[PDB]
Design a protein around this ligand. Structure first.
Ligand SMILES: [Cs+]
Ligand SMILES: [Cs+]
Ligand SMILES: [Cs+]
Ligand SMILES: [Cs+]
Ligand SMILES: [Cs+]
Length: 138
């Protein structure tokens, strides 16, 4: 039982999703821009990902720029509430499996939490080889 918080317009998210599939399971796909996590759920995700609230913020998106979030003037809960109100601020993708939750940047981080091994070689969109046919990480 796997969930991905996916943005189809993001290569890292696309690569991650295909690596999930290459492990033999079709995840539940949450288009977080339209269906963001509830506050409780977002707090849980951050906790399980073991990163700071700020480390989850997507830079170079309009609200990050306009709300001045680069500046160290925001408590964690201020940042959580901005992410809820402006889901494009949630960096991508977040993946949940029975083993754990990760912000999969770079995409191959997802290999940590996938239970089943890649079923064969995996090469990212741009041609970057990730695992060979034998299953070794390159
Ligand atoms: Cs929700
Ligand atoms: Cs806008
Ligand atoms: Cs693993
Ligand atoms: Cs393999
Ligand atoms: Cs790339």
């Amino acid at each position: 039982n796997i969930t991905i918080y996916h943005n189809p317009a993001c290569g890292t998210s696309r690569n991650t999703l295909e690596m999930i599939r290459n492990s033999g399971t079709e995840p539940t796909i949450i288009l977080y821009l339209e269906n963001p996590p509830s506050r409780d759920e977002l707090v849980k995700l951050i906790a399980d990902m073991g990163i700071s609230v700020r480390a989850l913020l997507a830079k170079n998106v309009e609200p990050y720029e306009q709300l001045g979030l680069a500046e160290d003037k925001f408590t964690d809960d201020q940042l959580i509430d901005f992410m809820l109100q402006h889901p494009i601020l949630i960096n991508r993708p977040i993946v949940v499996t029975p083993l754990g939750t990760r912000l999969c940047r770079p995409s191959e981080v997802v290999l940590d939490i996938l239970q089943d091994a890649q079923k064969g070689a995996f090469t990212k969109e741009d041609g970057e080889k990730v695992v060979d046919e034998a299953g070794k990480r390159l």
